[PDB]
Structure formats: structure tokens, C-alpha cells
Amino acid sequence: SKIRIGIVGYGNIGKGVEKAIKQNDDMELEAIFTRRDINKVDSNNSKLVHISRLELYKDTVDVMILCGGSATDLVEQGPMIASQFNTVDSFDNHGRIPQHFERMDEISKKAGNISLISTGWDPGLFSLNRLLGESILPKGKTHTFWGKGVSLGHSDAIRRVQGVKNGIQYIIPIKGALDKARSGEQCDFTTREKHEMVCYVVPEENADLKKIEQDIKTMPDYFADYNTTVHFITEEELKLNHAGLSNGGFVIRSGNTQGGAKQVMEFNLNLESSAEFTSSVLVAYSRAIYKLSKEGKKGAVTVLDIPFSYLSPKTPEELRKELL
Amino acid sequence: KIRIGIVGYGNIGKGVEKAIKQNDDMELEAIFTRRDINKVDSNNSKLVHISRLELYKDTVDVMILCGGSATDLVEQGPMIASQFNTVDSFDNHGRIPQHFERMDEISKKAGNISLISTGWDPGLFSLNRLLGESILPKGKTHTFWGKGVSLGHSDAIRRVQGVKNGIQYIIPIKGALDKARSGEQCDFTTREKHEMVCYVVPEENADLKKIEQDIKTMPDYFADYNTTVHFITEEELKLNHAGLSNGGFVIRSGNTQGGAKQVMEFNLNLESSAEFTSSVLVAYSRAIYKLSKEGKKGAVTVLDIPFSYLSPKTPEELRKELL
Numbered sequence A: 001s002k003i004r005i006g007i008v009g010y011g012n013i014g015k016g017v018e019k020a021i022k023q024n025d026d027m028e029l030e031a032i033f034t035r036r037d038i039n040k041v042d043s044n045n046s047k048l049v050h051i052s053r054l055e056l057y058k059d060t061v062d063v064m065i066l067c068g069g070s071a072t073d074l075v076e077q078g079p080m081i082a083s084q085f086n087t088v089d090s091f092d093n094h095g096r097i098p099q100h101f102e103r104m105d106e107i108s109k110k111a112g113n114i115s116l117i118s119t120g121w122d123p124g125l126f127s128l129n130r131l132l133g134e135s136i137l138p139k140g141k142t143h144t145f146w147g148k149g150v151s152l153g154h155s156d157a158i159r160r161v162q163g164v165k166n167g168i169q170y171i172i173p174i175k176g177a178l179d180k181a182r183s184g185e186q187c188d189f190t191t192r193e194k195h196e197m198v199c200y201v202v203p204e205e206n207a208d209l210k211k212i213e214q215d216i217k218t219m220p221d222y223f224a225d226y227n228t229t230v231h232f233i234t235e236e237e238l239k240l241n242h243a244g245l246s247n248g249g250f251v252i253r254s255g256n257t258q259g260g261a262k263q264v265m266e267f268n269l270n271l272e273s274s275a276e277f278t279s280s281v282l283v284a285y286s287r288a289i290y291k292l293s294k295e296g297k298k299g300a301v302t303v304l305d306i307p308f309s310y311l312s313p314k315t316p317e318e319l320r321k322e323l324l
Numbered sequence B: 001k002i003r004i005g006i007v008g009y010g011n012i013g014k015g016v017e018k019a020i021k022q023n024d025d026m027e028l029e030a031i032f033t034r035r036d037i038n039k040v041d042s043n044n045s046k047l048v049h050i051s052r053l054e055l056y057k058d059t060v061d062v063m064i065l066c067g068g069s070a071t072d073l074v075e076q077g078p079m080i081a082s083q084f085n086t087v088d089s090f091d092n093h094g095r096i097p098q099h100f101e102r103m104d105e106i107s108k109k110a111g112n113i114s115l116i117s118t119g120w121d122p123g124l125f126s127l128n129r130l131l132g133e134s135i136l137p138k139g140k141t142h143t144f145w146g147k148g149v150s151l152g153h154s155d156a157i158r159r160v161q162g163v164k165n166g167i168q169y170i171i172p173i174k175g176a177l178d179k180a181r182s183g184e185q186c187d188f189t190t191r192e193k194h195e196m197v198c199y200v201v202p203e204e205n206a207d208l209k210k211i212e213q214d215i216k217t218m219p220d221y222f223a224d225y226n227t228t229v230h231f232i233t234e235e236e237l238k239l240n241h242a243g244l245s246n247g248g249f250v251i252r253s254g255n256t257q258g259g260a261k262q263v264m265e266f267n268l269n270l271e272s273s274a275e276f277t278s279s280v281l282v283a284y285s286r287a288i289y290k291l292s293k294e295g296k297k298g299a300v301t302v303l304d305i306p307f308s309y310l311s312p313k314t315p316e317e318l319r320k321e322l323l
């Protein structure tokens, strides 16, 4: 008796999910659904199944982990899957989360299924820690920083600059801000104080380096609001040292107890592989959704509705004896 | 609206009284003390003798037990749980299983709900050890307790022959902490993680100071750690040793299929450890109040409670704001 997992999308996250399932003995991968031509990419990939045959697996999959891919169904297809399976997704558009929740709720309830929306590290683990911080310390301030990581949007922006062959951008928490937040003194940080941006650019022959540096730094919407540093490197260095697969971040609650005592709570992540970590979170939550589906839970839920006990394959007794 | 009863008025109890003030949806019904019935520390309103506990039946929604002990909780916990929903911070890890069993039986029978062992450890740290373990199944977990008193160890030394009074501190070792955060994974010996520093006020009848170091060779408590012992006067202790600050770290260093280094960390830096525990107890009382109203009965731990239950905000407000 194993939890039967199904993966939709075989991009970085889908591949990571397949790997993560290998680290979970209570789980088994039933199929990986892709839009790609199976006849083109197959032979031993027994698990690969064309997306058109997804409906044929509504009895073989307990939880469908939605790893979109990078198309469009990364927003409108989950509702399609929810109508036929219990789902788990990492919908990361914070501003549109309330909308996605409503749509997924109506659909999952209608189909008698349960859908977990917006899990991963952010949304997900960071969300949980923001909630925990303001709940434990109602009087104080919450600060979320997103550790060194790439902003695809900004990398595309860099490439539009005259004289730029190729390049990459990173957003990085400023140590000074982290130190201040971590101390007891509560304060509100300006955009410019929380994060800085570092770019690594490969210039075209000639180009005018100083002009590129300024074109990027004064770029509105992307860099204008942040202290930005531009490093000029070769194409070789770019491929070698900027795969851009790592990330991290910090969630800090700086509060005061009645009396002015400084109380600080911090949660952070340092991920060599952002995608694989997100996949691991997705798989852990699949165990939770499975348990909940079996209890008869219907509708959409978020990480905020799920007790951590559901994330473990161990029994309640074992947890209270080992970890509490 | 949520009616809270505070049981015990030591540091945690005092902290709960203040923390309740930081929560609009809560009200303090009374503070129950075991101080002599005849004359208390100023019988003024708030304080009420423990004998009157029974009279508050149906006027108190949650009884927060602030009787920092555990041994006392073994018996006092069940007694209260048979009359009210309860929340405690039972901190003896080894005996948590027994405590849970007893409180569960009692609360179930009385139709109440009892949250046991919340606080920062057990409690918050417990939640993060579980989280780390679930998200990164292949890896190692390391818990460190920042510089602060280790209460029990203070009592432990107060048991040494010739010790009038004293205090001990546990201090993480920077080296182990850095390694843990490195994501390399590696077992540590108790001695590699923390060191212990004691400050003892000798009951110097002329008592042997060198023998006072029974502390160092003391099984469990010390000996497994490099322990330093400083002798001082009750005057020095009282003024320079108000071991109120504390903290800790819970680090999970793992690898995902393929060898990618993934590190998760949760830590606390508390100027007032007791008041922080007090805040944790109050937030969880809100969750217990809600669970009770839903019909939940029996014993629960922080591992069974969704984080949304800790907030007075609506599920929609949380999703729109924090998700």
C-alpha cells in the first residue's frame, strides 16, 4: 500500500518531483504526463504518458502534483485536473491567490476532491513562518527577504540593453538590513535597504562598458530602485558560474513583549537547487493531501490549514516520542 | 471574548498576564495562586486562591498552566483538565508520552481538550524538527539552545553537596553551528555542540570548593560537556545573573536526489525567554478555544494544530495577506 503519485509537466519541477519520490518509501510514481510527443522521447521512460490520456488514470492516481511545465496551463489546467483528481500545486502569484483559491475550491468540492494550492517555499514555508511570527508576537514587524537568486524577468531585461551579448541578474538580501532586523530594534525598511541587485554581463565586441552599466542601473521598474552592481565576464564564465539554480531567503519577526523586551524569530533557507527543494515540499504535502482526502476532506486548502503531523509518514506516537 | 484563567503566577504566569493584553480577542478572568489562603501577596482582585478554581466552571474557556515544574504538572495537569480545557508547557521530553496519555484520558472523559508541551522547546522547535524531517527526508537535524539558563541544571547543581545557590548556562559552540549551516551533514557529540558555564554561591561552611565540582562529573547534566565553574556571592548572582535571555537553533541539513545541498533553519533570540513562552501559550490558547468549539476532545500537541488556528484573522484575510 503506497501513495500513488502522478506528475503533470516534466520540466525542472516535474523532474525534481520524480527524484523526490525516490526518497519517500511510502510513495510510488504512477505516471508523468507531458504534452511532448511520447514517440519522440521514450523507450525506457515507462512512466511517461501523453497528457491526452490523463482522464484514463482517475482510478490509479491518489494525488496529482501539478508541475505545469512552462506553457500556459500553468494557471488554467489545474482547474481541469482538480475536477478529476486531488491536486497539489505551487501557484506562486501572490496577488492572484485569492482568485485561484475560489476557482479551485468550487471545482474540487463539486468533484468531491481536495486541492492544495500555493505550496513550496514561497508561497509555502515562508507563508507559514510569516503567520507563525505575527501569531506568536502580535506586536512587532515581519520581514521577508529573498536570498541570492535569479529573477528571470531581470535577466531578460539585461539582454535588451545595447552592447549586451548575454547576462544574468541576482537579487540579494543586504546584510545590514538582515542584521538590523535580527537585532531587537524594529523598523520599516525601504526598498533600497532590503535588497541589492548584482548582474553579470557578457558584452558584445566594443559595446561601451560604462554605458551598459548605467543603462542597467537606471533601468526603470527593474533596477532603478535598487543599488545595482554590474560585473563584466566572458561567455565561458557565464555558463560555468551562473547556472542560476540556487536560491534562498529569510522570514524574520522582530517583536516586543509587553514591557519592551526584544523577541526575534527567524526562518531561512539556503537552497543549492531551488527547483528540487520546491519539488521536495510538493511531495511532502502530497502525503498530507492523501491523508486528508482519505478522511473525507473536500475543497481547496493551503499550507496554513494543514498540521505538520500530516507531512510525516511516522505515527503520532512516534513523533511525540522522537521529536516533541 | 476568549476567557483565560492563569494557573500559577511565577515568571511564565506574569508573562501570560502581559501577553493577554497584546491580544484584543482575549480577557483574563483570574490568576490562580497556591499562596496561602489566609493572606496572599496582596489579595487584590486579579489574584485568586487555587481553592476557588472550581467556582470558575463555565466562566473560563482555557486554563493556561504556568506551573513551571513538570513533576507538579503530572498531577495538577489531570486535575485541571477534568474541569477545563488546558494548555501547558510540560517540558520533560522523556516523559511527554506518559503526560499525553494521562491528559488524553482525563480530557476525553470530561469532554475537554488539553494541549500539552507547547512553548519554544517543546513547541516551536518541535514543529521545525518535524518540518525539516518531512521536507528533507534524507539529511540530519541539529538542535542548539542559545546562550541561556537550563533551569533543571540549575536545580541539579543546587543539589550538589555544599551548594547554597547557583545558576548554569548552556552555550552553543560557533564551530558546530557553522558546520551545521554548511550543509555538509555530520554527527556531533554532545561536547561538540554546547559548553556549560556555572556560577555557584558556595554554602561555604568552609565546604570543599574542589569537591563542589561534582557538577562536572555529574552524569547526564554535565560531564558530557566542557563545563566551567565560577564561585561567587549571592550578591553577585542576584545582580549579574538574571538568566532571562535565551534562544536556540533548529537546523536541517539535507540533500535532494543527486547531491544538491539544501539547508533549513529556524532560530530564536529572546531577551525574555519566559515572556516568549508566555506569548506562545497565549497564541495556542486561541487555537484550543477554536478546536474546543468544534467539538474536539482529548490531548493534542503543536504537531496536530494548523497554523491558521493561532490567528484571530479570517482564513481569507490570511490568504490575501500572508500566503
Ligand SMILES: N[C@H](CCC[C@H](N)C(=O)O)C(=O)O
Pocket: A321, A322, A323, A324, B093, B129, B141, B142, B143, B144
Ligand atoms: N529533546 C527532544 C528533541 C531532541 C532534538 C535533538 N536530538 C537534536 O535534534 O539535536 C527529544 O529528545 O525528543
